[PDB]
Amino acid sequence: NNPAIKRIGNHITKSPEDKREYRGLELANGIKVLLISDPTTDKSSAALDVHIGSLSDPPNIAGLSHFLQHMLFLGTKKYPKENEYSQFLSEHAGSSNAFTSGEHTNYYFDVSHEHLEGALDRFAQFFLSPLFDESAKDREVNAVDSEHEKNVMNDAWRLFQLEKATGNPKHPFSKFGTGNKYTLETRPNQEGIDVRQELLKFHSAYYSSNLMAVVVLGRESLDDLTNLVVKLFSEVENKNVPLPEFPEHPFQEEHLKQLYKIVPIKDIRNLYVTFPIPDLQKYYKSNPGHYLGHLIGHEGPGSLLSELKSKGWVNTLVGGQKEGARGFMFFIINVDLTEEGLLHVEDIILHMFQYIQKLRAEGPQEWVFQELKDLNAVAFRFKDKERPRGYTSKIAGILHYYPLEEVLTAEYLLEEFRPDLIEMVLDKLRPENVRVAIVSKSFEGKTDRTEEWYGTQYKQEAIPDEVIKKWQNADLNGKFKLPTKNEFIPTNFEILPLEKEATPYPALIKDTAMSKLWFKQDDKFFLPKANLNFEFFSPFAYVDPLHSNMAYLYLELLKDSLNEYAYAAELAGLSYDLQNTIYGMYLSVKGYNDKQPILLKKIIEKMATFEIDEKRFEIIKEAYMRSLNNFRAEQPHQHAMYYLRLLMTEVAWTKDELKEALDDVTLPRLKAFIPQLLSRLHIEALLHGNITKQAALGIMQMVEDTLIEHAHTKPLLPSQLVRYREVQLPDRGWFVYQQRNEVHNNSGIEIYYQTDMQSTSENMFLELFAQIISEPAFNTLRTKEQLGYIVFSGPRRANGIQGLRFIIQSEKPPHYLESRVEAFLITMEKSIEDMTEEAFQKHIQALAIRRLDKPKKLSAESAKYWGEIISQQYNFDRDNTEVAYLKTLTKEDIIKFYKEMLAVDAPRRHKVSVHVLAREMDINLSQAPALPQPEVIQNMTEFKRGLPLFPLVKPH
Ligand SMILES: COC(=O)[C@H](Cc1cnc[nH]1)NC(=O)CN(CC(=O)O)Cc1ccccc1
Numbered sequence: 009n010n011p012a013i014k015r016i017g018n019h020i021t022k023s024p025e026d027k028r029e030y031r032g033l034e035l036a037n038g039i040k041v042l043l044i045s046d047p048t049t050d051k052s053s054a055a056l057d058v059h060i061g062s063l064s065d066p067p068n069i070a071g072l073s074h075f076l077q078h079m080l081f082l083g084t085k086k087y088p089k090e091n092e093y094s095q096f097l098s099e100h101a102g103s104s105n106a107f108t109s110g111e112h113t114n115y116y117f118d119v120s121h122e123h124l125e126g127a128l129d130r131f132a133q134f135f136l137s138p139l140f141d142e143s144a145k146d147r148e149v150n151a152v153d154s155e156h157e158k159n160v161m162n163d164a165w166r167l168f169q170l171e172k173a174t175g176n177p178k179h180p181f182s183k184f185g186t187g188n189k190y191t192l193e194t195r196p197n198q199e200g201i202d203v204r205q206e207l208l209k210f211h212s213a214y215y216s217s218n219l220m221a222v223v224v225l226g227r228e229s230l231d232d233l234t235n236l237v238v239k240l241f242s243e244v245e246n247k248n249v250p251l252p253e254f255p256e257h258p259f260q261e262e263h264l265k266q267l268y269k270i271v272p273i274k275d276i277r278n279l280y281v282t283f284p285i286p287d288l289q290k291y292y293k294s295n296p297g298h299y300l301g302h303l304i305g306h307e308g309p310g311s312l313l314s315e316l317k318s319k320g321w322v323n324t325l326v327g328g329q330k331e332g333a334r335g336f337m338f339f340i341i342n343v344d345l346t347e348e349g350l351l352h353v354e355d356i357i358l359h360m361f362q363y364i365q366k367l368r369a370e371g372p373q374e375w376v377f378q379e380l381k382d383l384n385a386v387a388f389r390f391k392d393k394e395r396p397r398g399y400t401s402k403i404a405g406i407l408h409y410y411p412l413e414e415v416l417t418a419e420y421l422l423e424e425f426r427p428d429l430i431e432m433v434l435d436k437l438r439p440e441n442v443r444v445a446i447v448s449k450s451f452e453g454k455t456d457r458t459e460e461w462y463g464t465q466y467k468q469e470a471i472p473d474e475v476i477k478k479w480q481n482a483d484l485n486g487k488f489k490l491p492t493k494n495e496f497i498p499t500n501f502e503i504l505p506l507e508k509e510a511t512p513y514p515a516l517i518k519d520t521a522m523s524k525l526w527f528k529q530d531d532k533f534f535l536p537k538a539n540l541n542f543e544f545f546s547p548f549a550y551v552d553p554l555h556s557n558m559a560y561l562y563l564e565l566l567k568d569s570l571n572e573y574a575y576a577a578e579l580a581g582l583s584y585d586l587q588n589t590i591y592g593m594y595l596s597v598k599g600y601n602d603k604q605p606i607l608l609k610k611i612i613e614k615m616a617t618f619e620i621d622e623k624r625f626e627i628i629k630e631a632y633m634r635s636l637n638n639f640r641a642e643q644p645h646q647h648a649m650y651y652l653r654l655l656m657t658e659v660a661w662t663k664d665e666l667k668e669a670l671d672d673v674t675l676p677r678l679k680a681f682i683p684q685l686l687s688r689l690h691i692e693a694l695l696h697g698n699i700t701k702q703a704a705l706g707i708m709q710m711v712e713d714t715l716i717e718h719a720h721t722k723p724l725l726p727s728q729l730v731r732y733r734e735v736q737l738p739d740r741g742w743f744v745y746q747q748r749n750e751v752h753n754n755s756g757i758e759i760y761y762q763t764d765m766q767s768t769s770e771n772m773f774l775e776l777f778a779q780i781i782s783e784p785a786f787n788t789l790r791t792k793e794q795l796g797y798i799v800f801s802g803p804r805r806a807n808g809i810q811g812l813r814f815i816i817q818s819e820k821p822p823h824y825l826e827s828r829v830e831a832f833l834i835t836m837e838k839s840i841e842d843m844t845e846e847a848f849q850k851h852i853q854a855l856a857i858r859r860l861d862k863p864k865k866l867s868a869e870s871a872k873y874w875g876e877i878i879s880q881q882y883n884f885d886r887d888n889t890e891v892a893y894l895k896t897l898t899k900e901d902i903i904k905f906y907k908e909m910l911a912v913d914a915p916r917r918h919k920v921s922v923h924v925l926a927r928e929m930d931i932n933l934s935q936a937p938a939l940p941q942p943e944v945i946q947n948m949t950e951f952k953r954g955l956p957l958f959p960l961v962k963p964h
């Protein structure tokens with residue numbers, strides 16, 4: 009019946025809890041397509057994934073497909089304005105990104121539901137006729153350089169590329185995917201290449217319809233969506249490109265039995281063990297590598313990690329199958345290393361092979377496969393509903409691997425037990441196949457190679473045959489047992505009926521000296537899940553650096569002692585989060601409600617009766633020292649944010665201070681601290697989910713009762729519930745605090761224009777201003793001026809106060825960034841003056857849609873309430889309130905606000921700047937205004953002392 013469609017799939021299998029509707033099809037040009045109808049959705053989305061990526065770069069131009077991905081955003085023949093796509097999205101409440109992997113290029117956006125067509129049309133042009141404007145190419149090449157620059161001194165990226173540098177250098181695997189200025193401009197100009205041409209060639213050769221999948225999600229019917237996709241995508245030309253394949257492993261014979269000694273940037277100690285394996289993807293119905301991953305990576309009694317941890321050699325372990333590309337995969341087992349572990353690497357690996365050996369001895373286990381199958385079936389049935397943008401991006405990728413009918417279920421449902429495939433993979437995890445990498449500062453000086461892209465210093469050696477043979481003769485070790493039935497697997501999924509006295513917002517249902525309980529029965533999602541959130545206040549959690557360290561160490565020690573038992577819960581969809589804050593502790597327990605009271609109870613019980621294993625203490629204390637030390641290797645913009653938090657909060661201990669105070673933390677001293685911390689508390693909880701009022705009261709009271717029984721806890725006083733204040737900056741001031749980042753050779757800057765206390769009207773002035781300036785700040789500071797890859801603007805909220813911040817990481821110096829942002833703000837008053845009233849309403853509408861976007865899953869609704877609670881504002885209906893107010897605002901209100909609080913000669917401008925300098929320091933463009941001389945902050949304490957502090961916000 010239809011020339012444009014090759015076929016319509018059968019029914020797409022979905023969870024029976026999934027109210028969205030679906031239709032798969034294949035266009036005549038070969039594009040696999042999933043259509044998703046959600047008449048309830050606030051944002052629509054679409055994604056396109058092309059089955060080409062950096063593994064197909066021309067050898068002489070590294071990073072070409074990554075570059076190309078950047079360039080598609082910057083104009084096409086039908087919408088030639090460089091930032092048409094960005095601006096359209098921004099003005100209709102959308103967003104967009106894209107990524108390039110070895111074999112895919114994935115592009116996605118969301119938009120308000122009623123402007124899908126408009127968004128999708130501009131989007132489709134990416135794949136029909138991009139301009140690759142010459143002048144855009146010159147500029148954007150710097151954005152890609154900067155993206156690489158950021159990655160350079162980071163240990164994950166270095167290791168990632170050293171792996172590729174040490175296999176077969178002829179294999180596409182060894183290519184450098186990001187690219188940079190050298191690879192994408194300098195060297196190609198040197199070599200007479202015209203990059204605009206190369207982009208047109210690569211696009212034309214590889215952006216073929218037969219290599220594409222598209223997902224679209226909207227309020228429209230499945231028929232409307234179909235006509236829509238046929239319309240915008242039928243014209244993508246089919247060039248019938250063979251899908252690249254890499255049947256040959258990049259780790260051939262000579263790349264095996266090798267040892268690599270690598271010097272890291274941070275002070276980390278890791279061991280990476282790797283075996284090449286064939287491509288297991290086509291076995292997705294049985295999934296042998298997940299099976300083995302599950303076992304080798306287990307964390308329960310009997311497990312590999314258990315014994316490594318008991319010998320005091322390792323704290324954490326990752327194991328299982330690692331994606332490679334069509335043709336090859338890897339199997340990994342990686343662990344972090346204690347200082348002892350570092351000297352016992354040979355032994356650690358023997359234990360690995362001993363554990364592998366045990367699996368060979370017992371053979372494949374159908375009951376284990378059965379448990380993965382069941383958990384996966386339950387995870388699927390009751391999956392949370394995804395945010396539309398991520399969902400479309402993800403399915404676009406998997407439309408390339410699975411029959412249309414299976415795309416939703418393919419990654420969840422297991423169908424086939426395959427002892428043959430299990431055994432087959434197992435037979436590859438042998439010493440004669442092994443690669444070993446040790447990452448440690450102890451190799452500084454001792455190395456003889458340099459990886460070319462990142463500068464990684466490392467050494468390579470043959471592992472000696474004595475050593476391989478010792479690994480080959482690994483007997484069984486009786487400390488190693490398979491896991492036993494997982495008792496935490498839930499079976500009760502009843503959705504408790506909705507109560508007569510149930511409310512749209514959480515109700516305060518307990519207001520005692522000890523504890524304040526906010527409660528809501530879920531009236532929206534109906535999954536047998538619940539979230540249980542507790543803020544525990546104690547003045548002794550942050551009274552000083554020493555106490556801070558202790559709170560932290562206590563809670564790390566506790567998590568380490570619970571790990572074995574908690575791991576089962578975690579596989580059963582039941583997990584927890586436990587951390588120290590500046591107010592005392594935070595505990596969250598999330599997942600299936602069916603066995604949640606159990607886990608909860610075990611936590612509070614351990615918490616209140618904890619006995620510290622001294623050896624664990626010593627190891628964790630030491631990881632913590634490195635961890636604080638490792639802050640110096642975080643990125644310049646992270647430093648900038650960090651210093652501003654220290655400058656503007658009433659109380660905050662520096663990393664230095666915590667470090668100094670840490671050699672003072674002794675076992676005696678910690679043992680004494682725990683009961684001190686637990687002795688007086690206040691608890692403010694949010695219990696939200698598939699649970700009743702009375703179940704909720706009981707859970708609350710149980711937590712209280714356990715603390716009382718075991719630690720004798722008594723209530724705090726309403727007065728000692730000190731929430732902290734923000735520094736109040738003088739009318740017309742400007743302060744600069746300056747530091748050096750020692751590792752990275754970029755600078756960072758954060759600029760904060762403080763405004764006033766949060767409240768309905770101050771909130772919406774700032775927020776609308778941010779909306780208006782959001783996309784132009786990106787467009788001006790990154791796209792036109794190319795100051796860096798990281799360019800952010802938006803509201804800052806802390807401690808009840810607020811303002812407007814800019815954050816940029818750059819190669820240029822901060823005084824320079826300063827003036828371009830100031831230049832930008834003028835451009836902004838002017839474009840607000842010049843904009844139509846109707847362009848003004850579009851911005852109101854876009855923010856409105858953003859603020860009113862309904863949470864799609866339980867824990868997003870939770871998060872929203874929790875913010876209301878932890879900020880002590882309790883404004884649960886804030887969104888209809890603020891939106892009502894925002895609609896009454898005019899151009900004039902916003903010009904006044906800007907002129908009062910933000911303009912360079914604003915009467916109430918309150919400006920603070922953190923400048924973080926690079927490793928080594930000390931036109932076409934708009935006019936930057938002359939600036940006042942800043943007060944340079946010398947000392948963070950002198951500075952806070954010398955200034956007022958704001959009130960706190962009044963509760964609702
Ligand atoms: C199937 O389970 C695993 O293989 C392990 C779990 C583990 C826990 N402690 C150690 N290992 N997880 C992984 O290996 C992580 N990724 C793969 C990898 O890079 O190794 C698998 C994964 C990630 C997200 C969600 C589900 C599986």
Ligand SMILES: [Zn+2]
Binds near residue numbers: 074078152155
């Ligand atoms: Zn990029």
